[PDB]
Amino acid sequence: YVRQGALIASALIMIQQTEITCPKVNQFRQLYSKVINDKHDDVMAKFGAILAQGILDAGGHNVTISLQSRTGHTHMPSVVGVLVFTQFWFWFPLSHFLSLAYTPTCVIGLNKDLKMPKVQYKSNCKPSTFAYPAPL
Amino acid sequence: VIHKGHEKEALQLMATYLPKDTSPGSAYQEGGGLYALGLIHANHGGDIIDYLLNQLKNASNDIVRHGGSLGLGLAAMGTARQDVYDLLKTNLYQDDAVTGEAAGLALGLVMLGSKNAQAIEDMVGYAQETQHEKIL
Amino acid sequence: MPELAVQKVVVHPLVLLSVVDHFNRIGKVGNQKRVVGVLLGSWQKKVLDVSNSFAVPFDEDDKDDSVWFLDHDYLENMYGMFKKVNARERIVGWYHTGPKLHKNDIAINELMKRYCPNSVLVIIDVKPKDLGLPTEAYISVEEVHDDGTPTSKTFEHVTSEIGAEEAEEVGVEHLLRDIKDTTVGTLSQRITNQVHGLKGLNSKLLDIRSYLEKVATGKLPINHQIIYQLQDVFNLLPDVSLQEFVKAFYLKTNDQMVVVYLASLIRSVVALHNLINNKIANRDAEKKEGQE
Amino acid sequence: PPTDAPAVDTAEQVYISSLALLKMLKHGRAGVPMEVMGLMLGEFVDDYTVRVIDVFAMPQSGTGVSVEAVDPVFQAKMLDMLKQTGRPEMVVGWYHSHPGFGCWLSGVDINTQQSFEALSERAVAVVVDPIQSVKGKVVIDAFRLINANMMVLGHEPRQTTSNLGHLNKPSIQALIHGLNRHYYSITINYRKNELEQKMLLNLHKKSWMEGLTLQDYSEHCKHNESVVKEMLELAKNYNKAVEEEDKMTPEQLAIKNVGKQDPKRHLEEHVDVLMTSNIVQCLAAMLDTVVFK
Amino acid sequence: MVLESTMVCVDNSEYMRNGDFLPTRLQAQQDAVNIVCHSKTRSNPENNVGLITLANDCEVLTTLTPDTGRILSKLHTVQPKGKITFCTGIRVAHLALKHRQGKNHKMRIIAFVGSPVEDNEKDLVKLAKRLKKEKVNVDIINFGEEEVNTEKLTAFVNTLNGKDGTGSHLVTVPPGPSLADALISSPILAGEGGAM
Structure with a gap:
């Protein structure tokens, strides 16, 4: 039951940050599947290995955990978001409050009239740091 | 959670498992x-606060007031909103296993970020009497 | 007793827990009340090893002293109920939840005595406060007096303490891993005994001082006996052989240091040799830290 | 379904009050050979927690766990006798010892509990090992049979009530069809009151012990004599060890376990008893000189 | 009737060695008790019968038990001695009636008295107020002690009757040889309607 707290801890640590300065994300992702294919790891561990992948790909590689706003402020829905998820002290279905610290940080260009633009952004860097998964 | 983002049509999508x-x-x-409906309309509750208040007010099952407190909070x-804080307060003065757990959490959520110094001396005192690993 | 058939009354922890559980069984609005049970145990010398006990329905008026009720029939049923489960469990006395003695007690002592002569009381407390043990043992004896007053059933004190078995030991062990008391080593443990001992003498003497002050003024008829003994006390104080005692005590101390000196010295040498061992292990670890 | 279906899920726990446990250990160790058994009296809160408040043995025959001295008249008579004390309690379960080995249920064991399952539906069978339990955790588990029939019928992955977990092994003997066919593991707790804790905490009445006493000063010189001579004997061997260790590699001083009388270990073993003694030996005399001045 | 708790108060006294009733008043006392217990174990199928004494420091010889056979077997070994008291006895009777299996039984004391009472009426009618609180019924059987006594017990049994004539009644037994008055004056047919 320490393994259950160190697999999910890793998958929270890394959500769509990829090979930028932590190449370990292919090493741990392998390890999230290592212990689903096995029938030699305890259910109370497997349960924390499924979410290790389930939050990683959360939202389609779009949402991330960040308790305060990039503006700068600790907004409450996120704080509670990861405070009542981690908590399984006695209750097991507390595993949805992680949709309130999920934010799809993306530039949302909105036109002067509160409508939809068409406009794009130069690459100042290669698509490897841009990233986003590879379906195989 | 999967359909967080639907507003006026969410009552219909969840109308095939919701009561009535x-x-x-x-x-x-x-x-x-009910819990799901509090997930979709989390922090923006408008007509949904009333809907959930009519679902808890006339509730007679313990599971309904469980997930129901989780949606309403x-x-x-x-x-x-002093009305919902005292309804959820009656859930806790009723002393039933799984209704008082979710109801306790839901009352902490209703008064989130505030809490009257009276609500504290209410809740801690009621924690001295009670006896449970879930409600307490 | 004058008889060497009683002396060390040794109560096992589960009894203590048992009377402290009984005191909350009754405890509704019938609390603030003496509650009484019977002590089951074994013994075969100067001991009365107490082991089991069970409440006996008991009532008592709160202003009278001849209005007490004790379902002795209940006893002659249960006593057999527990015998049928463990042989070797006679009735070695009966306990009374304090806080101290009541005039009524002697009466009870004779409705319990209809079973076993030698029965003893074991006053146990329902409130931790004392710094000595919450277990005082009395016997119902009788005597004659130099004043010429009729014989009486008094109560006489016998030394007391609590012991244990392997079972008991282990359960208690388990229950005190919150309040750890083992972090404390030997030397300090016994210094604790010698400060905590003064914490006893201090309050015992204090109680005698309140008593003497109680008869001198705010009158309370004198009982010559107490004052008697209280004289032996002040003759026994170590005084009259002052000079010689001084010259000796100093000498025995002198010896004591001589041997402490030696002890601390050896201790030092040994620790230092330990240090040499560390330094040499460090040099040879430094040859390994290089290499490749 | 137009109405709820049967339910079971539960993280079943047993509180055993500091009173009970001591009785189960003691009485249970009484019968190392022929294990005893006893009824469990207490209350039953909500439906997640058994509260065993007290227990009491039952008699037996002279071969083992008979239920022909588990008379219904014994537990009847006793239940009435404890109503007249002030214990409105009911039977919640039955415990026994399997001393010397693992906390498991045997065929007769299982079967027996089946009777406490017909008579009543809420029964925990609690298990104490007065031998192995010695010192430390106190081996004590709890078990409840599981409907083996329903398991055969497809509810085999449906006997999982929501308990927490912590894994066992040596009883995998009958726990591989125990935990996973015949019963399961409940988890044990305690309730450490503060009044019981301040009670047991007592183990010394010192107002006549040390500090108001001190050993005999001719008994105390005969003690020093002996030790401080043993110092000499050990000393010599100590020089002979300091010449050796210098001229050898730590593998040969490692396996040096013939005559442990030589090394430091005994000069420390001594000095800390000697000193102790004496120092305090020391203060006791001084303290009394002022205290009873 | 309803299940009840009965307390037989028998008296020890030098007065319990008078030939003025059936051979010796001792023996006769025994027979009377033996009938009043048996007669209240057939009114109800279940009924608890006690047995205390009313002398010296009032004592219990058997607590509440349904077996008339214990009530008769302790009663054989009494002795006529001592000076009775009414106060001590009554008050220990309550303490014996509280402790019982089941709290649906009624509190009834069947009291036999037989030597001059030495308590003043002022205290007895305080105890009767405490019994009025505790809802205790008490029947007093004057097996003797009616010509050697001015009945303070009249103001005792009227302190328990605010309006009920069964709440408490003082039954007399004519002091002649009167074989036939200790059987009809019984409390199961003297001061109530039932006679089963």
């Missing part, structure tokens, strides 16, 4: 219905 249109069958999917989260 659905049989009292497995109160699990009714309580789960989310829809009126960060607010004050």
Whole structure:
């Protein structure tokens, strides 16, 4: 039951940050599947290995955990978001409050009239740091 | 969670497991219905706070007030609204296993970020009497 | 007793827990009340090993002293109920939840005595406060007096303490891993005994001082006996052989240091040799830290 | 379903009050050979927690766990006798010892509990090992049979009530069809009151012990004599060890376990008893000189 | 009737060695008790019968038990001695009636008295107020002690009757040889309607 707290801890640590300065994300992702294919790891561990992948790909590689706003402020829905998820002290279905610290940080260009633009952004860097998964 | 983002059409998507249109069958999917509705309308509860208040007020099953407290606390989260704080307060003065757990959490959510110094000396004192690993 | 058939009354922890559980069984609005049970145990010398006990329905008026009720029939049923489960469990006395003695007690002592002569009281407390043990043992004896007053059933004190078995030991062990008392080593443990001992003498003497002050003024008829003994006390104080005692005590101390000196010295040498061992292990670890 | 279906899920726990446990250990160790058994009296809160408040043995025959001296008249008579004390309690379960080995249920064991399952539906069978339990955790588990029939019928992955977990092994003997066919593991707790804790905490009445006493000063010189001579004997061997260790590699001083009388270990073993003694030996005399001045 | 708790108060006294009733008043006392217990174990199928004494420091010889056979077997070994008291006895009777299996039984004391009472009426009618609180019924059987006594017990049994004539009644037994007055004056047919 320490393994259950160190697999999910890793998958929270890394959500769509990829090979930028932590190449370990292919090493741990392998390890999230290592212990689903096995029938030699305890259910109370497997349960924390499924979410290790389930939050990683959360939202389609779009949402991330960040308790305060990039503006700068600790907004409450996120704080509670990861405070009542981690908590399984006695209750097991507390595993949805992680949709309130999920934010799809993306530039949302909105036109002067509160409508939809068409406009794009130069690459100042290669698509490897841009990233986003590879379906195989 | 999967359909967080639907507003006026969410009552219809969840209308095939929510009470009234659905049989009292497995109160699990009714309580789960209400909880889900508090997930979709979390922090923005408008008409949904009233809907959930009519679902808890006339509730007679323990599972319905479980998931129901979980939906209602989310829809009126960060607010004050003294009506829902005292309804959820009656859930806790009723002393029933799984209704008082979710109801306790839901009352902490209704008064989130505030809490009257009276609500504290209410809740801690009621924690001295009670006896449970879930409600307490 | 004058008889060497009683002396060390040794009560096992589960009894203590048992009377402290009984005191909350009754405890509704019938609390603030003496509650009484019977002590089951074994013994075969100067001991009365207490082991089991069970409440006996008991009532008592709160202003009278001849209005007490004790379902002795209940006893002659249960006593057999527990015998049928463990042989070797006679009735070695009966306990009374304090806080101290009541005039009524002697009466009870004779409705319990209809079973076993030698029965003893064991006053146990329902409130931790004392710094000595919450277990005082009395016997019902009788005597004659130099004043010429009729014989009496008094109560006489016998030394007391609590012991244990392997079972008991282990259960208690388990229950005190919150309040750890083992972090404390030997030397300090016994210094604790010698400060905590003064914490006893201090309050005992204090109680005698309140008593003497109680008869001198705010009158309370004198009982010559107490004052008698209280004289032996002040003759026994170590005084009259002052000079010689001084010259000796100093000498025995002198010896004591001589041997402490030696002890601390050896201790030092040994620790230092330990240090040499560390330094040499460090040099040879430094040859390994290089290499490749 | 147009109405709820049967339910079971539960993280079943047993509170055993500091009173009970001591009785189960003691009485249970009484019968190392022929294990005893006893009824469990207490209350039953909500439906997640058994509260065993007290227990009392039962008699037996002279071969083992008979239920022909588990008379219904014994437990009847006793239940009435404890109503007249002030214990409105009911039977919640039955415990026994399997001393010397693992906390498991045997065929007769299982079967027996089946009777406490017909008579009543809420029964925990609690298990104490007065031998192995010695010192430390106190081996004590709890078990409840599981409907083996329903398991055969497809509810085999449906006997999982929501308990927490912590894994066992040596009883995998009958726990591989125990935990996973015949019963399961409940988890044990305690309730450490503060009044019981301040009670047991007592183990010394010192107002006549040390500090108001001190050993005999001719008994105390005969003690020093002996030790401080043993110092000499050990000393010599100590020089002979300091010449050796210098001229050898730590593998040969490692396996040096013939005559442990030589090394430091005994000069420390001594000095800390000697000193102790004496120092305090020391203060006791001084303290009394002022205290009873 | 309803299940009840009965307490037989028998008296020890030098007065319990008078030939003025059936051979010796001792023996006769025994027979009377033996009938009043048996007669209240057939009114109800279940009924608890006690047995205390009313002399010296009032004592219990058997607590509440349904077996008339214990009530008769302790009663054989009494002795006529001592000076009775009414106060001590009554008050220990309550303490014996509280402790019982089941709290649906009624509190009834069947009291036999037989030597001059030495307590003043002022205290007895305080105890009768405490019994009025505790809802205790008490029947007093004057097996003797009516010509050697001015009945303070009249103001005792009227302190328990605010309006009920069964709440408490003082039954007399004519002091002649009167074989036939200790059987009809019984409390199961003297001061109530039932006679089963």
